[PDB]
From a paper:
[name] FD-1 is a gram-positive cellulosome-producing anaerobic bacterium that possesses the most elaborate cellulosome system thus far discovered in nature. The parent protein, RflaF_05439 (accession number: ZP_06142651), consists of a tandem repeat of two conserved modules at the N terminus and a C-terminal XDoc, which also binds to ScaE-Coh (unpublished results). In silico analysis of the structure implied that the protein belongs to an established superfamily of cysteine-like peptidases, termed NlpC/P60, and this domain will hereafter be coined [name]. The NlpC/P60 superfamily of peptidases is characterized by a conserved catalytic triad, which contains cysteine, histidine and a polar residue (i.e., glutamine, aspargine, histidine, glutamate or aspartate) within a catalytic core.
The X-ray crystal structure of the second module of the tandem repeat of RflaF_05439 from [name] FD-1 was determined at a resolution of 1.38 Å. There are no significant differences between the two molecules in the asymmetric unit (RMSD of 0.06 Å for all Cα atoms). The overall fold consists of two globular domains that form a tight interface: an N-terminal α-helical domain and a C-terminal domain comprised of 6 antiparallel βstrands covered by short α-helices and loops. The potential active site of [name] is located in the channel groove that runs along the interface between the N-and C-terminal domains. The crystal structure of the protein module described in this work allows the assignment of a putative function for the RflaF_05439 protein, which is identified to be a member of the NlpC/P60 superfamily, possessing the characteristic conserved catalytic triad residues (Cys109/His215/Gln230). A fourth residue, Tyr71, is also conserved. This residue is important for formation of a putative oxyanion hole, which helps stabilize transitional forms between the peptidase and the substrate. In the [name] structure, extra electron density was discovered contiguous with the side chain of the catalytic cysteine, Cys109. This extraneous electron density was modeled as acetate. In any case, is it likely that the modified cysteine would lead to an inactivated enzyme, which may explain why attempts to demonstrate protease activity were unsuccessful.
Author numbering: 23 to 268
The structure:
């Protein structure tokens, strides 16, 4: 069976709850309902995928188009009409927005409880993402800080046959040009890719901004539900479960 690393630690929902100082419940069912609703409406779908790591402005919240960030957004294909997203920026926004819907708090507050990049805060925009009290940030820092439960899979087939995945889990595709599994994710790389699982436990389905057609294809890109395709040609997988499974 699949061995869970950091087995005595915390699930993603629990970690977010802690980061929020118990202001956000991060309930699995509500997150799943949010995913169903916001994959179907016109808030995210259709937002251009753009090659700026800090892009986090979906069609429904085109916020970076109305601050100094607009210049960087425009260079890489962001638009005033539909905004623009990159992969981590999308997952950050989706989680933050879900927490805002659940709690009634403004997304500007809930985004502070969700990891993104350790350099997003230093960029100097109006919104901030999670950081440690010491000022570090990003996904592997979050995993280590909260001792997050995680799984590693060398193949997509192993992941999808493991019985571990639930809708709402976070999946990282780890660029096989820099490493395998979690160790690979700790290494700076061109093409690690993140998304939110939307399948039934065995189906190949996730919600992401990035490749929608094939592993390694960065021409055919968008913000949508699609199979789990990496930005890299070769991938292994890290799963950060949202909550304990049924």
């Amino acid at each position: 069976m699949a061995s869970m690393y950091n087995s005595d630690g915390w699930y993603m929902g629990e970690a977010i709850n802690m980061a929020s100082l118990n202001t956000c419940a991060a309930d699995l069912g509500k997150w799943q309902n949010f995913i169903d609703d916001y994959t179907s409406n016109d808030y995210y779908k259709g937002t251009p995928y753009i090659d700026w790591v800090f892009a986090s402005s979906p069609k429904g919240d085109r916020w970076q188009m109305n601050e100094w960030s607009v210049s960087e957004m425009l260079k890489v294909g962001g638009t005033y009409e539909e905004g623009g997203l990159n992969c981590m920026g999308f997952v950050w926004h989706a989680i933050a927005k879900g927490l805002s819907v659940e709690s009634g708090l403004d997304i500007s507050q809930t985004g502070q409880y969700v990891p993104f990049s350790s350099y997003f805060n230093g960029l100097g925009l109006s919104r901030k993402c999670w950081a440690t009290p010491g000022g570090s940030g990003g996904w592997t820092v979050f995993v280590d800080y909260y001792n997050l439960h995680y799984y590693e899979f060398p193949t997509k087939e192993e992941m999808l046959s493991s019985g571990v995945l639930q809708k709402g889990d976070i999946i990282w595709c780890v660029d096989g040009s820099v490493g395998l599994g979690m160790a690979g994710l700790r290494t700076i790389a061109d093409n690690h890719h993140i998304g939110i699982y939307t399948g039934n436990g065995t189906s190949d389905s996730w919600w992401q901004s990035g490749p929608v057609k094939a592993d390694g294809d960065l021409v055919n890109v968008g913000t949508d539900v699609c199979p789990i395709y990496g930005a890299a040609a070769k991938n292994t997988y890290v799963v950060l479960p949202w909550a304990k499974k049924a």
